[PDB]
Design a protein around this ligand. Structure first.
Ligand SMILES: Nc1ncnc2c1ncn2[C@@H]1O[C@H](COP(=O)(O)OP(=O)(O)O)[C@@H](O)[C@H]1O
Ligand SMILES: [Mg+2]
Lengths: 168, 134, 191, 283, 363, 7, 173, 414
């Protein structure tokens, strides 16, 4: 990935590492709470400006910021309709069992592909560099997964065709 | 039909809270002194100005100046700068980075890599926590 | 139970008391909190049962207090605590409405839920905006409310009784003395 | 199921339940049920009148008019004997069982009635094959578009027979999947010896269909199967007819099966992803 | 000198006069006290009547009183009566939350950096047997995260999250007397804004004062360090680097400076005399850490079931002590005051504690 | 009513 | 629970906690003779076929403790009698089981010891000892007359099937 | 000549099947599903991943029992389902082989237990709209279908919407009242004990009280319950001593046939003739958590709803469901409810004196056919109603809003 994806991964990793810093802030607007600030979007005091790391029109990522949480949204490089369908289904099956992850959301941001979430409650009970490493690894392995799914469906079609044609 | 309406019309302050030129940059470009072109591009930032015109002008000029560079003197260009200059640079690259199309990716990525090699994560922190619309 | 746990009505009724005390909380805006719950799973939390069993509760811990403002959830034709308060204040005279609104107390241990004052004040402001000013927000700015929430909201009646007995003990003409009981045509001694 | 069956098991089951208690006296067991099967055709079983001693079965064929115009006198005596009567429901072939007369056979009759749709469908293809076999002047080509908006065309000339398929996909999701499915249909031949040639065409309709008002458009593919006597004789005729008739539902079912297969694969990969993630939690 | 007191994080820490007792918040609705035993630590007491989360503790060198300032909009002043601890209810008139607290050198008043856009100051009263509370709300526009006090106890700096780090002037005539002349200003009455930050430089997470009371320094989320030198004409010095944001402030002497945060290890700074510029000092704590592991035949198969078998606990942060020391919460001092500080301690969000030295390095 | 009493 | 005890008049005496309800027996003990065939053991045997199924028992009256103890001992009696061969052998086994030393209430080795009381004085100790011995002997004599049948001279499967259905999930052992 | 829709009543037990506008569910098959799984050990990172076409190499239905080389694995467990891939495989197999219905040109109605979580319904609806591309879908509780089917008992023309239904199930039996078409949301309780654990208890007792059966053919032996072999009992101990006294005429015998060696084996019938069915009113035998009867639960749920609806509800209790086929069930329930309600009325009258005498509350239990299946006819009438074609969720609704359209529940609202 030295000449194709390495710089993009390095830049996004540095951005995440800088924006992975978090702290606990007692609720300032609603009685007594410590709920995530990014989702609520109550006070502009805590929010930080969004950032994007991208190299092509159809692929993108977004990096948010706040005291309580940092939100990241990705957009995959999908070209053909089969790629879009497979990505949507795979992400949906990932959603259906997102409880064990403790990091992932429950529905992607509108107009974008899957997005993750971090919080001060997920930074001490879990390691720090491991989470960013996993996000990176997912970003790389998505293309492998989609290509493998494509070849699998092609093989299935071939085998069914061969099985039917033999009778003739 | 009650809570439907917002009640968020408060009073507590929800944190209620010099552009660049073109002729000099063009002269530097045609003369070939790319370092002078970049220096002029970074000069006179729109730190205090509320108008999309100057913002887009600065973004376009910095993008055009950066694109023309080659991947041999980028280190020299970055080195001949001050730390505040490096931060302002990185801010400009991030600003123009959203600009898609016209293959404005690779050069920006190399610039970001060099800035990290020199500016460090502190530049990322500063750009992320700067309510200042730059 | 829906979540899939079977519970009795003998002792587990007391078991859920601690879980409600720790995890259960009330919201500020129902829509935003519901969207957060259905879009995220950070609000999930548990508690260690006496037998060591572990249970997950992330969404049920939020809608239970909502019955206070929406008695419809539990088969009651209620109107809501905030709406009831607004109606009661309005039905009174005029000179007393402002004084009642200025001074208000949140008494009782069941009101110790975190976030109830915010929900109540927001609801009252919404009622004032919609049923009086018809959405005129400009005139709504000066309206003021200060909920009285003493730190000792777990026990305040005992304080009142103690202070009353402090000064109402020397004089014997306050109580239903034992002597009056032996007579007929009695009771309703004072009111 | 891999090869979609042709015997509707609903009629088999209901007739088995009826006949297993047939020899139990005056047992009418009034029945009135409506069914549906592939090709968008509706079945109907109902007694003709208050007399429950007779059970009737009917069809609602979409292209029935073509069958009536062609004439199926062969089908009126070969497979179905005297237990066929004029149409009642919608001018479509309807049969009935005479319970008063002793039914000798039990499985053969049920099996014969099970393939009603294909039994009536064959009246045209088998007759065209007979035309080309008998040496009679090549009967005029015909087009048979069934309930689906797509169309079917057949040409029966000397020394060989031809058949072409038109394909239409409704939902945008399955269009590309079906295109991929049929792309490899025209090439898979390394496991078949005595099999016909297969080809796929979508942009350029075959020159045969230019004059015929068959399925013509943009998002419509074409499939043609070349026919030869080595696989269209009196022995290998029923198998070929069953395969071609069950072609559409076969494609559909295997598309859904592939969808389930990919669902299972992604579900399996989620476990690996979770295992990779678990490296972040402490010991 | 690393040590561990609990796996889960710890909110705040407080120490006694002799450095023999410790206060550790277990990140739960209570607070614990740890005491020395030879060269070992062991629990002694267990104080709990607060139904919320504790987020601020402090200790009185002489009064031996402890204050729990946290959630529930309340605050209890603990006092020792024989061999047991008892509470003391206080009233603060808060509606959102309270995070940080701090007593005074003379032990006459304490302040709370409440999250309700207000700063509260309280003093002892024997009349009603209560703790009366005043409020400062004029310039404040957001939450306050750090509070520090001045020897005379009349000047207070309350860092906030609105780009400002401002000194105040609180003087309760009931329990306060006129302070001596100060270079800053006139020691004006309670509830007023003395001066504000020169410009916008990130948020504020800490503040530090000086014995001479002529220099103030604070840190920010923008990887910046400031030093408000009031001896000159309000000379302001600034410095920056590539380090991650700092979350603490303290100095040794009139020129030195110490800080720590998400960098996972201490960072040292210094201030010039007349140049009006700071400098940098790298890893004054120690050169670097080390890493080790083991076979663990059981683990080799246990990890493969959930994680990858070849995986392990090794990390890039092991070499530079950046593996387990997850972030730094705040800082404290050991000996004397902010003059020599022969030793300095720091808190960690990892749930542990550690000590350091300033002379054992011996340059 | 609008002012005074409900109706 | 639902099928709790019965036949307990207030005049009945007690020994610390238990109810010294008379039992009719030809043996000797600190109990009187009741002419009616009805007694504690008869009701216990009558209701044992169902008490085991239930998983709770509220002690409405003091006789509930007697019912619990008698059923608990009957469980062990059935367990030990399943391997019987002759009526004489079964009677011998039941007799040698009655004259034993089982955990007395108020001492270790006794289930649900919390519910029962702890005797303090000396005399009540042997009073309870004799009462429990008499109850055990009467239970043994009562089981042997119905557990066996005139034919096959073996324990009926119907009466030993409940061997594994230990009351309250545990037995004396 | 509009095509009829499709009616399906999925569940833990025998899954009903057939088409709308018909008077008999044509196909009634178990939920048993085959699979070509075997003994791999890596079963938690590749559950199956069957190579090639072996994935579909599995049978279904009654034919799936007699395949002794695969695994019979029931996907459902009292409503909740762990893995739904088997459910999708079963659904495709049924729709294609048995129903032979094209999803793209048909409407499907599905039934789920009231306790089914929103997530399962949302995801099954998503699966349907994605794979089957069904134009319309609709899911509703089975109580109303039973109420509609109950009209056939007598006087169909006489409209009677009020009542209450206590339906059975392989793993769940629920209580749901109806008040003139509108049900009460909060007055619903879920009973975990059902017609399966009863058989578990039967076989557990039998494995010790008798011998002469093989381990494999146990459930076929345990299915004496489905035969005439279980009567309910007003009293428990009375019949216990009746059996322990005579034990000659009341005992029955079994003459089952082995399915392997074709060797006859017989065993007697004992106390289980009544204990099983009696467990319904004494659930404490099986489930220790739920020590609560049924009749008192019925009265409690009927006493937690408005006054004006309490009276007609007691008059209409429907006997629908397989587990309710036990004889004399209605008599016991009616007698118990009458006793408790009369006692409550007498207590209420005692506190306030008066020479009056309120008209006694009438409680009646109705016995009729359709008890085995009361959901299929309801679904048929559901499909036959034109308004169904309008209320059914459409494709475009699922296209961008998502599968949340099917999340509507009768016990939720904000
Ligand atoms: N005649 C019967 N006698 C006893 N039990 C029966 C009888 N018919 C059905 N059952 C029982 O009722 C259960 C089926 O009830 P049913 O509700 O149709 O299953 P489901 O919940 O999947 O719809 C079966 O497990 C069966 O044991
Ligand atoms: Mg059911």
């Amino acid at each position: 990935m030295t000449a194709t994806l390495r710089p993009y991964l390095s830049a996004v990793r540095a951005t995440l590492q800088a924006a992975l810093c978090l702290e606990n802030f007692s609720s300032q607007v609603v009685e007594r709470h410590n709920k995530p600030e990014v989702e609520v979007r109550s006070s502009k005091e805590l929010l930080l400006q969004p950032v994007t790391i991208s190299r092509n029109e159809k692929e993108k990522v977004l990096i948010e910021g706040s005291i309580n949480s940092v939100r990241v949204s990705i957009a995959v490089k999908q070209a053909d309709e089969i790629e879009k369908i497979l990505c949507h289904k795979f992400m949906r099956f990932m959603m259906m069992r997102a409880e064990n992850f403790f990091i992932l959301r429950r529905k992607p941001v509108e107009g974008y592909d899957i997005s993750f979430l971090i919080t001060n409650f997920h930074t001490e009970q879990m390691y720090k560099h491991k989470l960013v490493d996993f996000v990176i690894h997912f970003m790389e392995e998505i293309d492998k997964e989609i290509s493998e799914m494509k070849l699998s469906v092609n093989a299935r079609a071939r085998i069914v065709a061969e099985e039917f044609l033999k009778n003739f | 039909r009650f809570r439907k309406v917002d009640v968020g019309e408060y009073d507590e302050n929800k944190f209620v809270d010099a552009g660049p030129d073109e002729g000099e940059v063009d002269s530097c470009l045609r003369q070939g002194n790319m370092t002078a072109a970049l220096q002029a591009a970074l000069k006179n930032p729109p730190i205090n100005t509320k108008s999309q015109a100057v913002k887009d002008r600065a973004g376009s000029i910095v993008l055009k100046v950066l694109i023309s560079f080659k991947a041999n003197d980028i280190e020299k260009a970055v080195q001949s700068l001050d730390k505040n200059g490096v931060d302002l640079l990185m801010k400009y690259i991030y600003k123009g980075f959203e600009s898609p199309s016209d293959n404005s990716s690779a050069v920006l990525l190399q610039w970001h890599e060099k800035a990290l090699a020199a500016g460090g994560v502190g530049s990322i922190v500063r750009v992320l926590t700067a309510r200042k619309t730059v | 139970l829906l979540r899939g746990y079977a519970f009795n009505h003998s002792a587990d009724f007391e078991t859920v008391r601690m879980i409600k005390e720790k995890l259960c909380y009330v919201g500020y805006n129902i829509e935003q909190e519901q969207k957060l719950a259905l879009e995220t799973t950070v609000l999930v939390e548990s508690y260690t049962l006496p037998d060591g069993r572990i249970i997950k509760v992330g969404g049920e811990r939020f809608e239970a207090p909502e019955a206070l403002f929406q008695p419809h959830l539990i088969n009651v034709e209620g109107v809501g605590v905030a709406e009831l308060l607004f109606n009661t204040i309005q039905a009174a005279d005029i000179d007393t409405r402002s004084e009642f609104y200025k001074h208000i107390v949140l008494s009782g241990g069941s009101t110790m839920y975190p976030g109830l004052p915010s929900r109540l004040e927001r609801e009252l402001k919404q009622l004032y905006l919609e049923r009086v000013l018809k959405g005129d927000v400009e005139k709504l700015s000066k309206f003021k409310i200060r909920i009285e929430d003493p730190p000792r909201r777990k026990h305040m009646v005992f304080l009142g009784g103690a202070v009353l007995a402090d000064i109402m003990k020397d004089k014997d003409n306050f109580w239903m003395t034992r002597q009056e009981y032996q007579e007929k045509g009695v009771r309703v001694l004072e009111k | 199921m891999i090869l979609l069956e042709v015997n509707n098991r609903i009629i088999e089951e209901t007739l088995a339940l009826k006949f297993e208690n047939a020899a139990a006296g005056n047992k009418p067991e009034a029945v009135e049920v409506t069914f549906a099967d592939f090709d968008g055709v509706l079945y109907h079983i109902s007694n003709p009148n208050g007399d429950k001693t007779k059970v009737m079965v009917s069809i609602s064929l979409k292209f029935y008019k073509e069958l009536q115009a062609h004439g199926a006198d062969e089908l009126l005596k070969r497979v179905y004997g005297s237990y066929l009567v004029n149409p009642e429901s919608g001018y479509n072939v309807s049969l009935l069982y005479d319970l008063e007369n002793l039914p000798a056979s039990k499985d053969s009759i049920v099996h014969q009635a099970g393939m009603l749709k294909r039994n009536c469908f064959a009246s045209v293809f088998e007759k065209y094959f007979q035309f080309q076999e008998e040496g009679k002047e090549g009967e005029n080509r015909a087009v048979i578009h069934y309930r689906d908006d797509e169309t079917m065309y057949v040409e029966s000339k000397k020394d060989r027979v031809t058949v072409v398929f038109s394909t239409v996909f409704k939902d945008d999701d399955d269009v590309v999947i079906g295109k991929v499915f049929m792309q490899e249909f025209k090439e898979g031949r390394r496991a078949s010896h005595t099999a016909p040639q297969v080809l796929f065409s979508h942009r350029e309709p075959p020159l045969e269909l230019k004059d015929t008002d068959a399925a013509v458009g943009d998002n419509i593919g074409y499939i043609t199967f070349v026919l030869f006597p080595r696989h269209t004789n009196a022995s290998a005729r029923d198998n070929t007819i069953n395969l071609i008739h069950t072609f559409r539902d076969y494609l559909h079912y295997h598309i859904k099966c592939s969808k389930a297969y990919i669902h299972t694969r992604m579900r399996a990969k989620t476990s690996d992803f979770l295992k990779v993630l678990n490296r972040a939690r402490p010991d | 000198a690393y040590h561990s007191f609990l796996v889960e994080p710890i909110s705040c820490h407080a120490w006694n006069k002799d450095r023999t007792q410790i206060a550790i918040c277990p990140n739960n609705h209570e607070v614990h006290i740890y005491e020395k035993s030879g060269n070992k630590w062991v629990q002694v007491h267990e104080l709990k009547e607060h139904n919320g989360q504790v987020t601020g503790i402090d200790w009185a060198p002489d009064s031996n009183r402890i204050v729990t300032c946290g959630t529930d909009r309340n605050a209890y002043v603990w006092t020792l009566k024989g061999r047991t601890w008892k509470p003391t209810l206080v009233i603060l008139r808060i509606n959102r939350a309270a995070r940080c607290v701090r007593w005074a050198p003379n032990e006459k008043k304490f302040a709370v950096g409440s999250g309700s856009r207000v700063i509260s100051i309280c003093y002892f009263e024997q009349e009603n047997d209560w703790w009366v509370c005043k409020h400062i709300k004029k310039p404040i526009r957001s939450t306050v995260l750090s509070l520090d006090w001045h020897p005379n106890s009349v000047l207070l700096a309350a860092g906030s999250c609105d780009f400002k780090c401002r000194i105040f002037s609180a003087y309760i005539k009931e329990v306060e007397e006129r302070p001596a002349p100060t270079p800053w200003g006139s020691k004006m009455p309670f509830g007023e804004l003395m001066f504000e930050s020169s410009s916008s430089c990130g948020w504020v997470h800490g503040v530090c004062f000086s014995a001479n009371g002529s220099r103030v320094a604070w840190v920010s989320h923008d990887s910046t360090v400031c030093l408000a030198d009031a001896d000159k004409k309000m000379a302001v010095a600034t410095l920056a680097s590539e380090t991650l944001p700092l979350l603490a402030v303290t100095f040794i002497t009139e020129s030195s400076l110490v800080a720590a945060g998400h960098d996972c290890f201490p960072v040292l700074f210094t201030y010039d005399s007349a140049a009006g510029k700071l400098s940098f000092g790298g890893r004054l704590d120690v050169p670097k850490q080390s890493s080790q592991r083991g076979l663990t035949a059981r683990e080799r198969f246990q990890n493969l079931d959930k994680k990858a078998s070849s995986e392990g606990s090794a990390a890039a942060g092991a070499g530079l002590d950046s593996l387990h020391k997850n972030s730094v919460s705040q800082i404290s001092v050991l000996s004397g005051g902010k003059a020599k500080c022969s030793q300095f301690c720091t808190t960690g969000m990892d749930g542990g504690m550690s000590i350091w030295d300033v002379r054992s390095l011996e340059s | 009513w609008x002012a005074x009493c409900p109706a | 629970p639902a099928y709790h005890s019965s036949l307990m008049d207030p005049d009945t005496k007690l020994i610390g906690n238990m109810a010294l309800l008379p039992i009719r027996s030809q043996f000797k003990g600190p109990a009187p003779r009741e002419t009616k065939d009805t007694d504690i053991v008869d009701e216990a045997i009558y209701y044992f076929k169902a008490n085991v199924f239930f998983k709770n028992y509220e002690i409405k009256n003091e006789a509930d403790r007697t019912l619990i103890y008698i059923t608990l001992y009957i469980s062990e009696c059935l367990k030990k009698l399943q391997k019987c061969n002759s009526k004489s052998q079964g009677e011998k086994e039941m007799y040698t089981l009655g004259i034993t030393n089982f955990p007395i209430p108020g001492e270790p080795g006794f289930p649900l010891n919390a519910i029962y009381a702890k005797p303090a004085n000396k005399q009540e100790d042997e009073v309870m000892r004799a009462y429990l011995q008499q109850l055990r002997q009467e239970t043994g004599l009562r089981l042997c007359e119905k557990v066996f049948d005139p034919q096959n001279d073996k324990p009926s499967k119907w009466w030993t099937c409940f061997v594994k259905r230990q009351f309250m999930n545990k037995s004396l052992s | 000549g509009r095509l009829p829709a499709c009616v399906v009543d999925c569940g833990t037990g025998y899954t009903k099947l057939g088409y709308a506008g018909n008077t008999e569910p044509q196909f009634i098959i178990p939920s048993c599903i085959a699979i070509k799984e075997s003994a791999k050990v890596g079963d938690q990172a590749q559950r199956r991943v069957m190579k090639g076409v072996d994935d579909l190499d599995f049978f279904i239905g009654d034919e799936a029992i007699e395949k002794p080389t695969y695994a019979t694995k029931w996907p459902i467990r009292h409503g909740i389902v762990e893995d739904w891939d088997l459910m999708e495989r079963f659904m495709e197999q049924v729709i294609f082989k048995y129903l032979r219905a094209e999803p793209e040109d048909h409407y499907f109605l599905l039934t789920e237990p009231p306790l089914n979580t929103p997530e399962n319904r949302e995801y099954t609806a998503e699966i349907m709209f994605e794979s089957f591309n069904v134009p319309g879908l609709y899911i509703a509780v089975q109580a109303v279908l039973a109420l509609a089917a109950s009209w056939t008992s007598r006087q169909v023309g006489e409209r009677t919407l009020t009542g209450t239904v206590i339906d059975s199930g392989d793993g769940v039996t629920h209580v749901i009242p109806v008040a003139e078409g509108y049900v009460i949301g909060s007055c619903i309780k879920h009973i975990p004990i059902a017609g399966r654990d009863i058989t578990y208890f039967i076989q557990q007792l039998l494995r010790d009280r008798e011998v002469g059966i093989p381990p494999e053919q146990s459930l076929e032996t345990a299915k004496a319950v489905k035969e005439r072999y279980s009567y309910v009992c007003p009293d428990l101990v009375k019949e216990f001593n009746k059996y322990d006294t005579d034990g000659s005429k009341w005992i029955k015998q079994y003459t089952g046939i082995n399915a392997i060696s074709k060797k006859e084996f017989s065993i007697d019938v004992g106390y289980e003739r009544f204990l099983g069915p009696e467990i319904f009113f004494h659930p404490e035998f099986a489930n220790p958590d739920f020590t609560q009867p049924i009749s008192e639960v019925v009265d409690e749920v009927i006493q937690n709803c408005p006054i004006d609806v309490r009276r007609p509800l007691y008059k209409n209790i429907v006997l629908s469901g397989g587990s309710t086929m036990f004889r004399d069930f209605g008599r016991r329930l009616q007698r118990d409810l009458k006793r408790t309600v009369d006692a409550r009325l007498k207590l209420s009258e005692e506190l306030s004196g008066g020479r009056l005498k309120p008209k006694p509350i009438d409680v009646q239990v109705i016995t009729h056919h359709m008890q085995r299946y009361a959901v299929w006819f309801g679904g048929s009438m559901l499909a036959s109603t034109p308004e169904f074609y309008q209320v059914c969720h459409t494709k475009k609704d699922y296209e961008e809003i998502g599968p949340s359209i099917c999340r509507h529940n009768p016990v939720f609202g904000v």
